[PDB]
Design a protein around this ligand. Structure first.
Ligand code: CA
Lengths: 84, 87
């Protein structure tokens, strides 16, 4: 399983994807280095989480703070979820 | 915003989509009629959730759909590839 965030960026930069994860990490009180196996592919950011909070927790939290994520990164978040 | 379930069936049938919802509803102890504004688009099912006695959320029901993906797959033959919330 992996977490993902689909943005409006065509394509999403690696720098902006990591910025999303830094902000997300802060909101869940985890080190951003606990986001592992990160990739950007087209508009999407994908990631897993290291031993430390679950993917469910973090994608739920990404919804909770979506406004803040969008304002700080200058992009729009179109989907957040879990894949496998 | 909408909840969604992405399958490996393109086009996904409406009837199969709502069978997914019936299994999910049984698992979360909600009436399936509390899934509203339903559509199928490509391989995906999209929906919202009505006021319900259980006070359940989108992340809540889409999290659950991911947990019971083996059961959704066993019962319907679909493969569940993604679950999430969209805008
Ligand atoms: Ca937005």
């Amino acid at each position: 399983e992996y977490g993902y965030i689909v943005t409006d960026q065509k394509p999403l930069s690696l720098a902006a994807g990591v910025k999303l994860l830094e902000i997300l990490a802060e909101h869940v009180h985890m080190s951003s280095g606990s986001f592992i196996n990160i990739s950007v592919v087209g508009p999407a950011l994908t990631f897993r989480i290291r031993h430390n909070l679950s993917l469910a927790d973090v994608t739920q939290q990404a919804g909770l703070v979506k406004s803040e994520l969008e304002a700080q990164t200058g992009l729009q978040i179109l989907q957040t979820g879990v894949g496998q």
